Design a protein around this ligand. Structure first.
Ligand code: HG
Ligand code: HG
Length: 118
């Protein structure tokens, strides 16, 4: 199996052949389905992992293992278009600098879900 931490890295780390279409396919998000929404983070792995000891915040789901980054980070939001359907997944690409919120788990205590950005 792929671990939770490995899944996070494959889906979220990136330290109409548009970027989203390309990367969602490369990273095996859209080889076998079309995923509605995915964010990639253009920062070092280690700088993202460092968010797990930053500001503790509630997760959308009410758990309290989420952490918001002090700094805004370069991110690309990929969101499916209205007509997108498998196998021809189609994405809108939106680049932004925003604080990230990740859920953290394990020893070492590392990101395991991308909760949001703000
Ligand atoms: Hg995952
Ligand atoms: Hg994943």
């Amino acid at each position: 199996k792929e671990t939770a931490a490995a899944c996070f890295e494959r889906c979220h780390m990136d330290s109409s052949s548009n970027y989203c279409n390309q990367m969602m396919k490369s990273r095996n998000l859209t080889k076998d389905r079309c995923k509605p929404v995915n964010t990639f983070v253009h920062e070092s792995l280690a700088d993202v992992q460092a968010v797990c000891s930053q500001k503790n915040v509630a997760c959308k789901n009410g758990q309290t293992n989420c952490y918001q980054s002090y700094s805004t980070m370069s991110i690309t939001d990929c969101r499916e278009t209205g007509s997108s359907k498998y196998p021809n997944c189609a994405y809108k690409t939106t680049q932004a600098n925003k604080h990230i919120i990740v859920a953290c788990e394990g020893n070492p205590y590392v990101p395991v879900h991308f909760d949001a950005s703000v």
